[PDB]
Structures are given as C-alpha cells and as structure tokens.
Design an enzyme around this catalytic site. Structure first.
Site, PDB file in Angstrom:
ATOM      1  N   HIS B  25      11.239 -68.303-100.162  1.00  8.40           N
ATOM      2  CA  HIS B  25      11.919 -69.474 -99.626  1.00  8.40           C
ATOM      3  C   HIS B  25      10.922 -70.611 -99.499  1.00  8.40           C
ATOM      4  CE1 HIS B  25      14.243 -65.973 -98.357  1.00  8.40           C
ATOM      5  NE2 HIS B  25      15.299 -66.768 -98.282  1.00  8.40           N
ATOM      6  N   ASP B 153      19.001 -74.654 -88.760  1.00  4.25           N
ATOM      7  CA  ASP B 153      20.445 -74.750 -88.533  1.00  4.25           C
ATOM      8  C   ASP B 153      21.071 -73.370 -88.383  1.00  4.25           C
ATOM      9  OD1 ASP B 153      20.476 -77.633 -88.918  1.00  4.25           O
ATOM     10  OD2 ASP B 153      20.226 -77.189 -91.079  1.00  4.25           O
ATOM     11  N   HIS B 259      16.266 -73.945-100.913  1.00  6.75           N
ATOM     12  CA  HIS B 259      16.179 -73.119 -99.713  1.00  6.75           C
ATOM     13  C   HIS B 259      15.519 -71.782-100.022  1.00  6.75           C
ATOM     14  CE1 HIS B 259      17.440 -70.256 -96.645  1.00  6.75           C
ATOM     15  NE2 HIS B 259      17.977 -69.549 -97.620  1.00  6.75           N
ATOM     16  N   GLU B 413      24.864 -60.254 -73.487  1.00  8.26           N
ATOM     17  CA  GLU B 413      24.154 -59.033 -73.853  1.00  8.26           C
ATOM     18  C   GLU B 413      23.188 -59.256 -74.990  1.00  8.26           C
ATOM     19  OE1 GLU B 413      27.523 -59.163 -73.900  1.00  8.26           O
ATOM     20  OE2 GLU B 413      28.060 -58.108 -72.089  1.00  8.26           O
ATOM     21  N   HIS B 476      36.512 -50.226 -73.464  1.00  7.59           N
ATOM     22  CA  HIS B 476      35.274 -50.089 -72.727  1.00  7.59           C
ATOM     23  C   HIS B 476      34.583 -48.738 -72.954  1.00  7.59           C
ATOM     24  CE1 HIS B 476      36.614 -53.677 -70.756  1.00  7.59           C
ATOM     25  NE2 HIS B 476      35.709 -53.603 -69.792  1.00  7.59           N
ATOM     26  N   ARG B 523      29.397 -43.405 -64.849  1.00  5.24           N
ATOM     27  CA  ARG B 523      30.092 -43.915 -63.681  1.00  5.24           C
ATOM     28  C   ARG B 523      30.358 -42.820 -62.667  1.00  5.24           C
ATOM     29  NH1 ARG B 523      36.111 -45.633 -62.309  1.00  5.24           N
ATOM     30  NH2 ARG B 523      35.705 -47.513 -61.056  1.00  5.24           N
TER      31      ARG B 523
HETATM   32  C1  LIG Z   1      30.938 -58.947 -66.955  1.00  5.91           C
HETATM   33  C2  LIG Z   1      32.337 -58.715 -66.966  1.00  5.91           C
HETATM   34  C3  LIG Z   1      33.342 -59.269 -66.088  1.00  5.91           C
HETATM   35  C4  LIG Z   1      33.110 -60.693 -65.505  1.00  5.91           C
HETATM   36  C5  LIG Z   1      33.876 -61.810 -66.108  1.00  5.91           C
HETATM   37  O1  LIG Z   1      33.664 -62.933 -65.212  1.00  5.91           O
HETATM   38  P1  LIG Z   1      34.826 -64.035 -65.476  1.00  5.91           P
HETATM   39  O2  LIG Z   1      35.235 -64.118 -66.907  1.00  5.91           O
HETATM   40  O3  LIG Z   1      34.375 -65.290 -64.853  1.00  5.91           O
HETATM   41  O4  LIG Z   1      36.084 -63.416 -64.682  1.00  5.91           O
HETATM   42  P2  LIG Z   1      36.655 -63.746 -63.243  1.00  5.91           P
HETATM   43  O5  LIG Z   1      35.486 -63.384 -62.258  1.00  5.91           O
HETATM   44  O6  LIG Z   1      36.952 -65.160 -63.056  1.00  5.91           O
HETATM   45  O7  LIG Z   1      37.675 -62.749 -62.990  1.00  5.91           O
HETATM   46  S1  LIG Z   1      34.904 -58.655 -66.303  1.00  5.91           S
HETATM   47  C6  LIG Z   1      34.413 -57.348 -67.274  1.00  5.91           C
HETATM   48  C7  LIG Z   1      35.030 -56.066 -67.283  1.00  5.91           C
HETATM   49  O8  LIG Z   1      34.415 -54.839 -67.587  1.00  5.91           O
HETATM   50  C8  LIG Z   1      36.496 -55.973 -66.912  1.00  5.91           C
HETATM   51  O9  LIG Z   1      36.750 -56.266 -68.253  1.00  5.91           O
HETATM   52  N1  LIG Z   1      32.844 -57.411 -67.344  1.00  5.91           N
HETATM   53  C9  LIG Z   1      32.100 -56.541 -68.213  1.00  5.91           C
HETATM   54  C10 LIG Z   1      31.965 -57.032 -69.665  1.00  5.91           C
HETATM   55  C11 LIG Z   1      30.734 -57.291 -70.185  1.00  5.91           C
HETATM   56  N2  LIG Z   1      30.599 -57.659 -71.456  1.00  5.91           N
HETATM   57  C12 LIG Z   1      31.660 -57.704 -72.248  1.00  5.91           C
HETATM   58  C13 LIG Z   1      31.400 -58.077 -73.703  1.00  5.91           C
HETATM   59  N3  LIG Z   1      32.892 -57.489 -71.860  1.00  5.91           N
HETATM   60  C14 LIG Z   1      33.040 -57.117 -70.569  1.00  5.91           C
HETATM   61  N4  LIG Z   1      34.368 -56.834 -70.203  1.00  5.91           N
HETATM   62  C1  LIG Z   2      22.436 -67.348 -93.935  1.00  6.44           C
HETATM   63  C2  LIG Z   2      21.027 -67.222 -94.033  1.00  6.44           C
HETATM   64  C3  LIG Z   2      20.065 -68.220 -94.442  1.00  6.44           C
HETATM   65  C4  LIG Z   2      20.380 -69.714 -94.142  1.00  6.44           C
HETATM   66  C5  LIG Z   2      19.664 -70.348 -93.009  1.00  6.44           C
HETATM   67  O1  LIG Z   2      19.948 -71.767 -93.137  1.00  6.44           O
HETATM   68  P1  LIG Z   2      18.841 -72.596 -92.289  1.00  6.44           P
HETATM   69  O2  LIG Z   2      18.414 -71.894 -91.044  1.00  6.44           O
HETATM   70  O3  LIG Z   2      19.365 -73.961 -92.120  1.00  6.44           O
HETATM   71  O4  LIG Z   2      17.565 -72.587 -93.272  1.00  6.44           O
HETATM   72  P2  LIG Z   2      17.035 -73.688 -94.279  1.00  6.44           P
HETATM   73  O5  LIG Z   2      18.198 -73.872 -95.317  1.00  6.44           O
HETATM   74  O6  LIG Z   2      16.814 -74.982 -93.646  1.00  6.44           O
HETATM   75  O7  LIG Z   2      15.968 -73.053 -95.025  1.00  6.44           O
HETATM   76  S1  LIG Z   2      18.471 -67.671 -94.578  1.00  6.44           S
HETATM   77  C6  LIG Z   2      18.878 -66.022 -94.501  1.00  6.44           C
HETATM   78  C7  LIG Z   2      18.196 -64.984 -95.194  1.00  6.44           C
HETATM   79  O8  LIG Z   2      18.741 -63.763 -95.630  1.00  6.44           O
HETATM   80  C8  LIG Z   2      16.733 -65.188 -95.531  1.00  6.44           C
HETATM   81  O9  LIG Z   2      16.473 -64.702 -94.249  1.00  6.44           O
HETATM   82  N1  LIG Z   2      20.447 -65.954 -94.432  1.00  6.44           N
HETATM   83  C9  LIG Z   2      21.131 -64.712 -94.202  1.00  6.44           C
HETATM   84  C10 LIG Z   2      21.269 -64.309 -92.724  1.00  6.44           C
HETATM   85  C11 LIG Z   2      22.503 -64.172 -92.167  1.00  6.44           C
HETATM   86  N2  LIG Z   2      22.637 -63.767 -90.907  1.00  6.44           N
HETATM   87  C12 LIG Z   2      21.567 -63.421 -90.206  1.00  6.44           C
HETATM   88  C13 LIG Z   2      21.824 -62.912 -88.793  1.00  6.44           C
HETATM   89  N3  LIG Z   2      20.333 -63.521 -90.629  1.00  6.44           N
HETATM   90  C14 LIG Z   2      20.186 -63.934 -91.907  1.00  6.44           C
HETATM   91  N4  LIG Z   2      18.850 -63.971 -92.348  1.00  6.44           N
HETATM   92  O1  LIG Z   3      35.170 -56.200 -64.209  1.00  5.88           O
HETATM   93  C1  LIG Z   3      35.051 -55.203 -63.696  1.00  5.88           C
HETATM   94  C2  LIG Z   3      34.753 -54.039 -64.621  1.00  5.88           C
HETATM   95  O2  LIG Z   3      36.035 -53.512 -64.854  1.00  5.88           O
HETATM   96  C3  LIG Z   3      33.906 -53.418 -63.562  1.00  5.88           C
HETATM   97  O3  LIG Z   3      32.560 -53.862 -63.495  1.00  5.88           O
HETATM   98  C4  LIG Z   3      34.054 -51.899 -63.518  1.00  5.88           C
HETATM   99  O4  LIG Z   3      33.708 -51.633 -62.184  1.00  5.88           O
HETATM  100  P1  LIG Z   3      33.108 -50.236 -61.690  1.00  5.88           P
HETATM  101  O5  LIG Z   3      31.689 -50.360 -61.259  1.00  5.88           O
HETATM  102  O6  LIG Z   3      33.923 -49.777 -60.554  1.00  5.88           O
HETATM  103  O7  LIG Z   3      33.267 -49.296 -62.820  1.00  5.88           O
HETATM  104  O1  LIG Z   4      18.111 -66.805 -97.676  1.00  6.75           O
HETATM  105  C1  LIG Z   4      18.186 -66.254 -98.657  1.00  6.75           C
HETATM  106  C2  LIG Z   4      18.409 -64.759 -98.537  1.00  6.75           C
HETATM  107  O2  LIG Z   4      17.098 -64.258 -98.614  1.00  6.75           O
HETATM  108  C3  LIG Z   4      19.239 -64.786 -99.775  1.00  6.75           C
HETATM  109  O3  LIG Z   4      20.607 -65.121 -99.607  1.00  6.75           O
HETATM  110  C4  LIG Z   4      19.014 -63.555-100.651  1.00  6.75           C
HETATM  111  O4  LIG Z   4      19.365 -64.055-101.915  1.00  6.75           O
HETATM  112  P1  LIG Z   4      19.901 -63.136-103.109  1.00  6.75           P
HETATM  113  O5  LIG Z   4      21.331 -63.405-103.421  1.00  6.75           O
HETATM  114  O6  LIG Z   4      19.080 -63.427-104.296  1.00  6.75           O
HETATM  115  O7  LIG Z   4      19.675 -61.738-102.686  1.00  6.75           O
HETATM  116 CA   LIG Z   5      18.807 -76.060 -92.570  1.00  4.17          CA
END
Ligand SMILES: CC1=C(CCOP(=O)(O)OP(=O)(O)O)S/C(=C(/O)CO)N1Cc1cnc(C)nc1N
Ligand SMILES: CC1=C(CCOP(=O)(O)OP(=O)(O)O)S/C(=C(/O)CO)N1Cc1cnc(C)nc1N
Ligand SMILES: O=C[C@H](O)[C@H](O)COP(=O)(O)O
Ligand SMILES: O=C[C@H](O)[C@H](O)COP(=O)(O)O
Ligand SMILES: [Ca+2]
Ligand SMILES: [Ca+2]
Lengths: 675, 675
Positions: B25, B153, B259, B413, B476, B523
């Site tokens: 690149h 980007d 690129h 996460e 979950h 749990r």
């Molecule tokens: C962190 C989280 C809660 C807070 C939301 O906080 P919020 O969206 O502001 O809601 P509220 O307080 O206004 O009710 S719920 C949830 C539950 O396990 C009940 O689904 N978990 C865990 C949770 C963590 N990560 C993902 C990807 N999905 C989840 N589900």
């Molecule tokens: C989409 C992407 C490119 C564009 C970046 O576009 P950009 O960050 O604006 O870079 P640039 O044009 O200014 O050079 S590179 C990359 C490579 O496989 C070389 O690593 N892939 C694939 C790519 C897709 N998704 C993840 C999570 N990681 C990646 N690596």
């Molecule tokens: O949003 C609440 C999720 O359902 C929750 O964290 C689960 O609660 P627990 O600790 O009783 O399992």
């Molecule tokens: O950013 C470029 C990645 O390395 C690329 O998409 C890989 O290119 P390829 O199609 O030659 O494998």
């Molecule tokens: Ca770029």
C-alpha cells in the site's frame, strides 16, 4: 381522557407482566408508554395481517423493554393475549424475555443485543426506499411506509449504531424516524459516568434531522407533532429526543434499580391508585381503551383494503411489474431462475472462487430483481458488483438512485450485517448479500448470530478465506472463523471448491428462506474438478472420487479439495488407494438422509479431513484431521502452504500415517454415535 | 532543506519497499510522510530501548500503511534495517504486510484490522493517565508521555472507533493526539460514495479538541504547531485533521488505485527525479537524513538518561512506591501474591462463579496494584468492582480520579476489548480485565483475536455463560462462543466449576504474560466440589473422581462438573462405575506433558464429554459428546436444563449408551492420533 387511560393501561400491563414473571425490565416501558401510544396511533398496520407489505414497521431496539411492545400488541389485537402476558419470560411462551421475530406476532426482528434494532430499522428503511423506487408509478404509491424505531442510551453507545446512523444519514433515508429514550440512566447508573457526549450534535453531524420533546413523560401532542415534522423532512432520517423519566410513576423512578428488576408490590399499588386503577387488580384492560384502539385498527384495515384495490389496478396498468411484484409477495423466485447459474467442466480454466462468485452475480442479478447487495469498502476485492448496475444512493447525490441494486456500505461490517437483517425483514422476497473478507465477518458476529436466530436468508460473500490470501498476513487470515459460524445453529457455511460448487452455493443462498449463508471464497485460483456438479454439490457433501477398495477417504473443502485429489495421486505411487469427498456445506450435508450421508462417509474405512483452518467440528466427518490451528504468516501464499505442509506430499504423508494407525482396528463411520 | 530531504526519503523507502514485494500500500505512506516526519521529531523514544516506560507511543491505526512505519523505524535506527525493508511482505521477514508487535521492534500493537489502533491508543493513554496518577509526585514526573495515533477514513467508519472516541472524550484524555489522514479516498473510491458525515463536528460532540491542517502535503510547520496546541489542551484528546493527497507525488495521486497496489516503474522514476533522487537507485538513505535523525535520537537518549536518574531519586524519596514501580518494570508480580486467592472446601456453601470472581477480585486488587479493570455497563451483573475502590474518571467530573482502578466502559464491548489491549501494551505489568456477558464478548471478536495474536495478557470476566442465565433467553445464551474462542490460537478459556477452580483461573489470568484469558462464569449457584483444589485445577484438566475400574469417564467443565458427579451416583445404581474429569481450561491442559494428560484421559475406557454448549472441539478429549447445538430458550434456568435433558438422569442415560456402544471394541485415548 381515553388517551391518558390508554397510557396508564400500557404502563400497568408491562409492570404486571414483569411482576408475574418476577423477572424483566419495567423502567423503560414506564418511560416510553406515552411515546408508544403516540407512535402506534400514527402507524398503519393490520394486527390480522402482519405481512401487509405497505405497513409501517416498528422496531424496539432497546429489546429489554419488550413488556412495552407485548402490551401494545395485545391491546391492538395481534395474535397475543393477556394470557400470554401472564406467561412473560416463561418457558415456551409467546412472550420471551427479549422479542423474537420467529415467535412473536408483530416483532419484525429479534432484538435484545443492544444496537441491533436501530440498524435493522436502517435496513427496513433502505429496503422500503429501494422497493418504492422499483415499483411506484404515478398514481400508484405501492410503497410509502415509514420505519419507526425506539432505542436507548445502550444502543447509542454500541458502535454498530454509529456505523448504521452515519450510513443512513448519507443515504438520506427520510422515512426512518427513530426515538431516543433520553432518560440518563443505564445499568451502571447515571449516563454521567460513561456517556457524556452530545448525542444530538453527533446525529446532526451524520445529516439527521432532530426534534426534541422535552416532556415526553406526558406530552403526546408534542410526540405526535414530532412525527408530523419528521415526515416533512423527506431527505433526512430523524432522531426524536424523548426526555423521559425511567420508571415514570414508580417510587423508584429515575434510578438504575427500576431498569431491570420487578417493582415492589407496594409500588405497584400506588401506581394503580394514582392512575385511577384498582390496586387489587392485575392485567386490567379498560374497555374504552380497547374501543379506541379498535377504531384505529378498523381505519388501518380500510387503508389496507384500499391498498389491495390499488395493487389490483396496478397489475392492470403495469402488467409486467405487477406480476413481478405478485410473485415476490408470494415468496417465489422466478421460474427456472437457476438455469442462469454458470456450469463448468474440467476442461475450463482455473478461477478463484471470488471471481466465480462475481460471474454468478453477473448472471443472476439481471434475472432476479429481488437480489440486492453490497460490500463493506471491498467492492474491487470481493468482486460483488455486477458490471452495469447502478448503486443505491439518493439521486440528489448524482452517485446512484434508490432504484439501484448495489450498496456502498463503507468500512462498516457489523452495521452491514444488521442492515442485511433489516432488508430481509422488510420481506418482498429480498435476497440480499454483503461482501467483506472472511476474517472481518467476525466484526459483525453480533448481527450474524441474529441472522441465524431470526431465520433470515441473508448471504455473506466472504472472500480471502485463508492463508491463500498471502501477503496481507495473519491479521487478515482466518483460522477460527469457519468453526465459529459452523458451531452456531442455523448457518450454512459454504466453502466451494470450484465453479460448479460455487453455483450450488448460490443456488442454496438465493433459495433460502430461513437460513443465513456465508460463502467462504478464495483470492487464489482453483482448478475445475473432475466429478463436480451443481447436482452433487447441492447435497452439501458428496463423493467426488469413488474408490471401491479404498484404504482411506480424504474429506476436504474449498481450496483443499484439489489438494486432496493431488494427494490421491501421490498415494497411488505408495500403494495406497484413496477416495475423495468434497464437503462444501456441512449444514446442508447434515440435513441429508442418514443413508445418503453413510454412502459418502461409510463404515470400514479410515477418513482424514483436510482444510487449512481450525480442526474444530471436523471429527463429525473424519477419524483424523489435518488442519491449521495456529495463526498464519505474511508471505506469498504458495510459500505459506508449503511451510505448513499443505502440499500433496504433506497430505499423503498424513494419509499414510492414518492408514497405518488403523491397521488391525475395526473402523466405523464418524457419522455413527452412541446417542 | 534536510527536512524536505527526509520526507522524500521516507516516501521513497516506502514506495521502494512496496515495489520490491510487488504487494502492499503506497498511497497513505506517500500522503502521511510529512506528518510522520513531524510527529517523530516531536516524540521522545529510544530505538535502543523500545520499552522505556516514559516514551511517547506511536500507533499506526491504518496499519496497511506500514511501509511508512517501517521506514521511520529504519531511519531512526531501531532493530530494523533497509535489508528488512527489501523483504517487506516476504515469508519470515521482520516487515510483515501489517505491523505485528510480536515481530516488529517499535510496533506497540498489532494493527491492520481497521479501527483497532485508535482504540489501542485510547488504552495506552488511559494507562498512562492511571500510571502517572499512581506514581507521579512533586518534582517527580515519572510518567508524562503522549500517545500519537495515525488513522484513516476506514478507522473512522468502524464503529469500534466511535465507541473508544466517545469514551476517550468523556475521560478527558489530554495526552492522546490523533491525526486523521483526510484524503477522501478509500477502496471503493471517493468517500463521497459512503462517508459524507461531518467528522469534525462528530469529534467535537465527543468533547475532543480539533486542529485542522489544510495543507498537510507540505506544511510541517503547521503539523508541529498542531502538536504544540494539542499539548496545551490538557483536558481533551485532540484530533488533528491532516488534509492530504493520497499517493502525493505519484502520477496516480488522489485515486483509489494508489491505495493498495504497487506503483508503476515509470511513476517511481518521476517521483525520484522530482524530489532530487537518482531514479536508478532504490532504498536510498541520504547521510544528511541519517545525521538529522541521529541528532534527535541522541537528544532523546539524554532525556531517558535523565529520567533514569529521576527514577533513582524517586526511589530514595518514595521508598515504597519506588520499589513497587521497580518490581512492575521488572515484570514481576508481588511475592506470594497468590496467597490472597480464596480457597474453599466441600463444606462451604454453593456460590455462582460470578460471585466467586467478585470475591477473588476483592482479595487480589488491594494486593496487586497493577490490576485495573471495568465492565461494559454490567458492573452489578458481572460483579467486577471491588467494594471501596474508586472509579477511573477525571477528577474534574467529581466521579472518580485518574488514580482510580475501575473503568466504566459503558455499552462498548468492542472498544473495551481494544482498550484492554492498549492498557496491556502500555506495559508496567498491567493486568487488566473487562466484564460483560459471555454472549456479548462476541461483539468484541475483532479485538479479542488481536489479544491472542499480539500475546497480550488481558482478561475477559464473561459472566452469564449459558442457558443457566434463564429468562433473558436465547439472544443472551451462548452456544457457539466457547468453541469460537477455543478454536482461536492462544486463548485460555477457563470455565471454572467452583471456588477453587475460580481461584486457579485467576491465578492463570494474572500470571499470564503472553496469553489472553476469557473466564466463563455463571449466573447460577454451583456447589463446592469434593476433590477440587487450586493445585489440580492449575493443570487445566484433572481427575476429580478417580475410578480404577471405570466403565466410563465423564469429562466436563463449569456448571456441568457437578452434573457429572450427580450422574455418577445414578450410574452406580445401574451397575456402571464412572470417573469424572474436570477440564477448566483446555489450553492449559493441552500444554501439560503427554504423560500427565494420559493420566487424566487414559486408554482403555470410553470417555463422554458434558458441557451445555457446542460440542465442537470436544472430540479432542472424548469419544462421545453431550452438548447443546441449538439456540436456548426464555424461561427459568432449571426448566431449560430439564428441557434439554442436562440432568443427572439424562447424563447417565447417555453414559450408559456410550458404555453399550463400545462393548466389544478396543478403545484408545482421544489424545492419541495418527500424526
Ligand atoms: C448493558 C445492558 C443494558 C443497559 C441498557 O441501558 P439503556 O439502553 O439506557 O436502557 P434503560 O436503562 O433506559 O432501560 S440492558 C441489557 C440486557 O442484558 C437486557 O437486555 N444489557 C446488557 C447488554 C450488553 N451488551 C449488549 C450488546 N446487549 C446487552 N443486552
Ligand atoms: C477496507 C479496507 C481498506 C480501506 C481503508 O481506507 P482508508 O482507511 O481510507 O485508507 P487509505 O485509502 O487512505 O489508504 S485497507 C484494508 C486492508 O485489507 C489492508 O488492510 N481494507 C479491508 C478491511 C476491512 N475491514 C477491516 C476491519 N479491516 C480491513 N483491513
Ligand atoms: O438488563 C438487565 C440484564 O437483563 C441484566 O443485567 C441481567 O441481570 P442479572 O444480573 O440478574 O442476570
Ligand atoms: O487494502 C487492500 C487490501 O489489502 C486489499 O483489498 C487486498 O487486495 P486484493 O484484492 O488484491 O487481495
Ligand atoms: Ca482514506
Ligand atoms: Ca437509558
């Protein structure tokens, strides 16, 4: 008023459902009941026809708040009753602890994992725009529906929602109206502890329109007016800030303790009395509320009845488009569409399966209008765009049109996965796909698992499947990825070896109605195989080279099938006779009859698997496994294969050792088991 | 000027490296060479001591641009030479196609998967703030270093970077200085096709400071001034917008074609002549550039020499803190720290392993200052905070202090996973952890895999491991999750059954120096087991119940070990004698001696595995597998276990069928193999 009584009814149904389960989330239902009432009174829907294609869609992205959704569905007479609410969160009920589209009438998608539902709503809205651009004509607004999404602070913190919101603003999706439950409370307490960004300024930076409702605990007039305002802004998705009190009305309102646990019994009593309900009664549904809601259902049913007449008139005025639309609404692909799939012979040139995929798409996209798809900034690498098609973009940009068929997702794998689920959820037989490198499908695991649980026929075009990609190195080379998705229930993971198998993989992916597909495709060229066909590869696993006196069978996928065939020749010079099995999709194979499967993997012969990735799962089909259980390397791909002994001689050596290991042993098929 | 010559040297080294590999690149290296020159001239670092704890850190988040990073490291005399540049992207070289911290001197982290490096930089900056708050004293600026990140980007489109940028702004991380390569080009072409958001307005909404450099192709004075300005803003991370031309100087500058592929030979010739280089020469390093760069290295080495004297003086003035800091810089845990781990007996009460984890953390956090960690908005559910500790927050908020030890990640996460990798990368023996539900560790798979490849000792506290969580239901409940991470190389996946095993799991996680850990925790309550100990569980797998005349051995993990022990009693009434093996970590077990492993899983006896999740991987250790290969259910957990027959009678039934299936057969250990 009756509206006030309806809001109280919603709040109390949700609280009583949580109380009966002694589990679940009362806070957000209490805070969002006014908004839910107001939005459903603006929505067009038929509780007796959940699949009306011009319905407005609702998505509860904060899926933990599902007692709210279930209460609305019950009050409007969907196929869900108060008796189901009494079984909230109980084994086997129609009211699970997070909404599931397979189980809950009126749940468009499965939510609960935060961030997903808003992205699904972006996909529903994208599909509606594409569908309307494809079918609408002057005097024929076949599709003009809105997508309403509720989401909370959790969804706004998950990165997947940022990806989809940036893309939705770029795509000018003016029929998307989202509502942020701005209650300043999550599980860890105040949002001041971790979420102090200016959300509104961020959504303006994506090109969204904003409406703020400062008293969403009571001001349904302002919530309705915000919907009206959003509908006037036809070139921007809108975020409505609903400033609410979590658990509104509870003694514990405004606290994290009301987010996620049942209210105390005395709190429920005071809620009921303050709102005019009997504190001795649970699951009350005042008849005046039913009457008011029934009025709105009857009006909506007359709207659908008029739409059915519009559709009949459309079929007269636009006979070809009308028949296409009817076929899609019936869930049927074009007759004999699969005759467009390319077929190859062993005399044809070697081709990478990414290029074979491009060729398939080029043949089938013009034949099957419900195919749309895109790539996550890897279009020239995944080879996912058919030449001559137009991109899906707002025409105002000059870069495409909403009638386009190719989506530039940008570097947004997770949102692409959840948007694909929304496009599938829209319906109308959409068969949609998304390209990235296989190793980066893992970025989207949250959405991919939901494709499987939701039974959506989406397709990942997952190229660069292995160390065969070469120089980009171990950060890009899958090892664990196929094991991960094969271990997920209900994912068809095709790893085609050649042109005929690639056509079989697409036949499966496009015919699917309930199973998502991942197509693992190569960067590097592979030969056309002697013995492959669409017919045999459609079985998921098949005997490629039959050897009646086999000392061993080699089972392989993808790039390793040709390797197995070359190893058979080395083994012949060592006095060892081998058969070869190609296993392009383990799920499809597993669904074949027991006798078919035993004809492929019989008793009485050692079986060795060969696949240049994890050995997990392979003991289902083999006695010994040759795989790659370490990270890759940056170098020219053939040198990496040689380093790891994925060569004809390396496979033959392990095959000979397998024959020797079973000398004097009784061998039964890996398909046998004790239970 | 010499600066202009240095910039040209950097550009041409990178282009010549890509040319020699015929892969990689060139575009972003060409566009970012001015900024790289300017930033490295502001950075304090020692090429001869890559681990100086007060160095500024640099992270190339757009890792595909690594020819740029490798050129800087070569020019500054790291342990990387022009001969290594000539081996760019070649098998076994020190210059892989994306930077790897295990292989490349001066690569702080492994990048290449987009979005990760900026989040790693947030973690490096978080750690530096926590470290400085812990150790700095008046007249003793032990830690005052900056974290510089380049990103493009692609990184800005990935949701993980939004998560970390929102959190970094909330945390007021004023020593983080990021630089956006604003070149308006990605793989799919212009950013107008998919990325039209106002990035600057979004970063302002997170609370970042902004500096814009409108001519970053040439204006190194303005880039240096932007760094100076950023350093004055001590309560906000800064984003420097570098408006560049991708491939600057190339005939193909400003296009997607530059690129990701080598330049044409004639393009390289005209680059060299326009910049005063010999078009017949490759890998030129003008001696004046070396001299200028050497000057800066010598100055930095004098700064490190003074820091070493400051550290010696600190040890005199602050004897206790100085010895603690020395121990951490030596990579050693406190002597006998593990005596703080709780120990249990079978007479103790049943406890959920999430609660056992809380108790461990409560005992070890006060004893081991280099432990810090947090949760992704699940603190009261994961039980990850020790009572009495203070949160890591800027003191200006009133909600914590930078000397705090507990991080409120919010619902983020993926960013939590990548931030943990940055905290580990900072060094100083940090042993850091992050809590969420096991099923949502999958949201962070992009970062988790990089923990494994980068050999970072981070720890996921992954509670709610199975259907045992009950009512939240199948959205979950993990099924595939342990298989996915066990199939990834170099991940220790502990699933402790009881109090002693939980202490063993933490002993492993905290002692780790090169292997990330996932602790899968319940749990629901589990009994203390007869036969468990920290000593035996530290082996990863051990004989819990030895039966010399075993008809079968049951191997299990976590919640299923107690189930296996109960099944042994049912089997005894059927005339079947069983042994039990507990396998709390498959990776640790696999690393034991062959004779130890065979003592646990001997020849001559059928072995049945029991674990309430995918059966993938289990054939390594068993002949037959009882697992859960379908999605879960929403209901009370004991009812779900009964539905799927994970009961003592259900396990016994499958064990009896296994004994019958092997009658008359010769059985050898699952540990045996043909090769
Ligand atoms: C962190 C989280 C809660 C807070 C939301 O906080 P919020 O969206 O502001 O809601 P509220 O307080 O206004 O009710 S719920 C949830 C539950 O396990 C009940 O689904 N978990 C865990 C949770 C963590 N990560 C993902 C990807 N999905 C989840 N589900
Ligand atoms: C989409 C992407 C490119 C564009 C970046 O576009 P950009 O960050 O604006 O870079 P640039 O044009 O200014 O050079 S590179 C990359 C490579 O496989 C070389 O690593 N892939 C694939 C790519 C897709 N998704 C993840 C999570 N990681 C990646 N690596
Ligand atoms: O949003 C609440 C999720 O359902 C929750 O964290 C689960 O609660 P627990 O600790 O009783 O399992
Ligand atoms: O950013 C470029 C990645 O390395 C690329 O998409 C890989 O290119 P390829 O199609 O030659 O494998
Ligand atoms: Ca770029
Ligand atoms: Ca909230």
């Amino acid at each position: 008023s009756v509206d006030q009584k309806a809001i109280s009814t919603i709040r109390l149904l949700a609280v009583d459902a949580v109380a009966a389960a002694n589990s679940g989330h009362p806070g957000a239902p209490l805070g969002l009941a006014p908004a839910a009432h107001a939005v459903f009174k603006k929505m067009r829907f038929n509780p007796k026809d959940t699949k009306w294609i011009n319905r407005d869609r609702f998505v509860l992205s904060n899926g933990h708040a599902c007692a709210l959704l279930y209460s609305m569905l019950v009050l409007y007479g969907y196929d869900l009753t108060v008796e189901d609410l009494k079984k909230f969160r109980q084994l086997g009920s129609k009211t699970p602890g997070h909404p599931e589209n397979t189980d809950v009438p009126g749940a468009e998608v499965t939510t609960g994992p935060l961030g997903q539902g808003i992205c699904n709503g972006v996909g529903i809205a994208l599909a509606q725009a594409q569908f309307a651009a494809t079918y609408n004509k002057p005097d024929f607004p076949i599709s003009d529906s809105y997508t309403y999404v509720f989401l909370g602070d959790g969804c706004l913190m998950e990165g997947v929602s940022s990806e989809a919101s940036s893309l939705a603003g770029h795509l000018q999706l003016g029929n998307l109206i989202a509502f942020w439950d701005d209650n300043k409370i999550s599980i860890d307490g105040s949002t001041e502890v971790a979420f102090t960004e200016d959300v509104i300024a961020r959504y303006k930076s994506y090109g969204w329109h904003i409406v703020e409702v400062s008293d969403a605990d009571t001001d349904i007039t302002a919530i309705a007016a915000a919907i009206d305002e959003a509908k006037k802004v036809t070139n921007k998705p809108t975020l409505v800030r609903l400033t609410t009190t979590i658990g509104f009305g509870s003694l514990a309102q405004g606290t994290h303790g009301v987010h996620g646990a049942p209210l105390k019994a005395d709190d429920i009593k005071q809620l009921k009395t303050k709102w005019g309900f009997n504190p001795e009664e649970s699951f009350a549904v005042p008849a005046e509320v039913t009457a008011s809601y029934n009025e709105h259902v009857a009006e909506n049913q007359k709207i659908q009845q008029q739409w059915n007449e519009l559709f009949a008139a459309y079929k007269q005025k636009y006979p070809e488009l009308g028949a296409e639309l009817q076929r899609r609404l019936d869930g049927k692909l074009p007759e004999n569409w699969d005759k467009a799939l390319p077929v190859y012979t062993p005399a044809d040139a070697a081709v990478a399966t990414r290029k074979l995929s491009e060729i398939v798409l080029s043949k089938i996209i013009p034949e099957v209008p419900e195919i749309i798809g895109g790539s996550a900034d890897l279009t020239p690498s995944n080879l996912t765009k058919a030449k001559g098609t137009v991109d899906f973009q707002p025409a105002a940009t000059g870069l495409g049109d909403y009638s386009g068929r190719y989506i530039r997702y940008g570097v947004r794998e997770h949102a692409m996965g959840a948007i694909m689920n929304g496009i599938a959820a829209f319906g109308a037989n959409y068969k949609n796909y998304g390209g990235t490198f296989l190793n980066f499908v893992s970025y989207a695991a949250g959405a991919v698992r939901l494709s499987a649980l939701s039974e959506f026929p989406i397709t990942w075009v997952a190229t660069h499947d292995s160390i065969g990609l070469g120089e980009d190195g171990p950060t890009h080379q899958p090892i664990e990825t196929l094991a991960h998705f094969r271990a997920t229930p209900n994912i068809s993971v095709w790893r085609p070896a050649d042109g005929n198998e690639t056509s079989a993989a697409y036949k499966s992916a496009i015919e699917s109605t309930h199973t998502p597909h991942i197509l693992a495709l190569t960067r590097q060229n592979l030969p056309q195989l002697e013995g492959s066909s669409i017919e045999k590869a459609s079985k998921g696993g098949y005997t490629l080279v039959q050897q009646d006196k086999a000392d061993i069978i080699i089972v392989a996928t993808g790039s390793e099938v040709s390797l197995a065939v070359d190893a058979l020749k080395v083994l012949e010079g060592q006095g060892i006779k081998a058969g070869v099995v190609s296993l392009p999709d383990q799920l499809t194979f597993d669904k074949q009859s027991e006798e078919y499967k035993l004809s492929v993997l019989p008793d009485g012969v050692p079986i060795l698997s060969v696949e240049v990735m994890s050995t997990f799962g392979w003991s289902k089909y083999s006695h010994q496994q040759f795989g790659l259980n370490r990270f890759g390397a940056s170098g020219k791909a053939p040198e990496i294969f040689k380093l790891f002994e994925f060569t004809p001689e390396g496979v033959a050596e392990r095959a000979a050792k397998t024959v020797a290991f079973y000398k004097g042993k009784d061998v039964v098929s890996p398909l046998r088991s004790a239970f």
